[PDB]
């Protein structure tokens, strides 16, 4: 329900020069995931693939992990745990790995780990960090968001932030970045609309 704490959202590139990257996908009607650099905001469709790129200047130590966590973007809602609405929580869309209440899933990684924090009650999802493939400059993780922003009983039209943290095997934070998310039926159109408020 309510958490007694709120995760920090402060960008931290750290010693390994950690940044996020996104595909430059544009805003055509078919696009299922598109990122606004001006808004630092991902627009994506429910349950579709959202590529998030990890960029580092140097290789993290062995055993490093990558955690994703959602919080409400507006400070007034930040103590409220981000979770799926009742409708989606009960629907039959289980992949056999993710808890039904969790908003954020990782796709295509059998080493995915999900956490219900016993103290803060927040949900998160973790994968081992892996260096880029040969000929590549970044590591891609495929996320899925399993509720719409408009889902009542869940996000209730409230914007969220995804916080990505790079975590080492001794408990230190190696890096952190974040981006706003809107999960919606028409990411391309919605991105143009929201960017129109600029200019």
């Amino acid at each position: 329900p309510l958490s007694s704490s709120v995760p920090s959202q402060k960008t931290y590139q750290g010693s390994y020069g950690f940044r996020l990257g996104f595909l430059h996908s544009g805003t055509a009607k078919s696009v299922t995931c598109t990122y606004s650099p001006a808004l630092n905001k991902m627009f994506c469709q429910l349950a579709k693939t959202c590529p998030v790129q990890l960029w580092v200047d140097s290789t993290p130590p062995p055993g490093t992990r990558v955690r994703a966590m959602a919080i409400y973007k507006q400070s007034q809602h930040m103590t409220e745990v981000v979770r799926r609405c009742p409708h989606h929580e009960r629907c039959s869309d289980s992949d056999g790995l993710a808890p039904p209440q969790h908003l954020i899933r990782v796709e295509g990684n059998l080493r995915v780990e999900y956490l219900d924090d016993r103290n803060t009650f927040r949900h998160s999802v973790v994968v081992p960090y892996e260096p880029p493939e040969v000929g590549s400059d970044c590591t891609t993780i495929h996320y899925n968001y399993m509720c719409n922003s408009s889902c009542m009983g869940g996000m209730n039209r409230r914007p969220i932030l995804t916080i990505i943290t790079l975590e080492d095997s001794s408990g230190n934070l190696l890096g952190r970045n974040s981006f706003e998310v809107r999960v919606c039926a028409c990411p391309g159109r919605d991105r143009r609309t929201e960017e129109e408020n600029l200019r």
Partner: nanobody, 122 residues
Framework: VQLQESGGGLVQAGGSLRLSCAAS????????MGWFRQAPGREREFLAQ????????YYAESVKDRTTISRDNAKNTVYLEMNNLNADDTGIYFC????????????????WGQGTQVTVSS
């Protein structure tokens, strides 16, 4: 980077100790922290570790039942609480930061505090 412990001093037998450690710099909130103690004659001993966010903790088995480690990153401070103290709890208590050799080790810590004396007395 520059660690300071507080809360030491005389403690009644059966009472509890409440220590804290804070660093001056914003890099504190990215570091796991640890608490150690060293009794006269004996080697330095691991007590508890907590990760950068405070969500994850680990205790030495010998003190686990009556020890709590916590932190407040807003205030850049980590806390150690230990209950039901006895004579063998007397010693110098150290705060350390940025472990590089995993969980519950005495080696591999980048920063160390100067330590605070705790004396269990009747």
């Amino acid at each position: 980077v520059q660690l300071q412990e507080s809360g030491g001093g005389l403690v009644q037998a059966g009472g509890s100790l409440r220590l804290s450690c804070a660093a001056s710099e914003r890099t504190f909130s990215t570091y796991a922290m640890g608490w150690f103690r060293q009794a006269p004659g004996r080697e330095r001993e691991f007590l508890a570790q907590i990760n950068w966010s405070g969500t994850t903790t680990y205790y030495a088995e010998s003190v686990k039942d009556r020890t709590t480690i916590s932190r407040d990153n807003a205030k850049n401070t980590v806390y150690l609480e230990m209950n039901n103290l006895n004579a063998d709890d007397t010693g110098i208590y150290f705060c350390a930061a940025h472990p590089q050799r995993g969980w519950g080790s005495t080696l591999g810590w980048t920063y160390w505090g100067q330590g605070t004396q705790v004396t269990v007395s009747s």
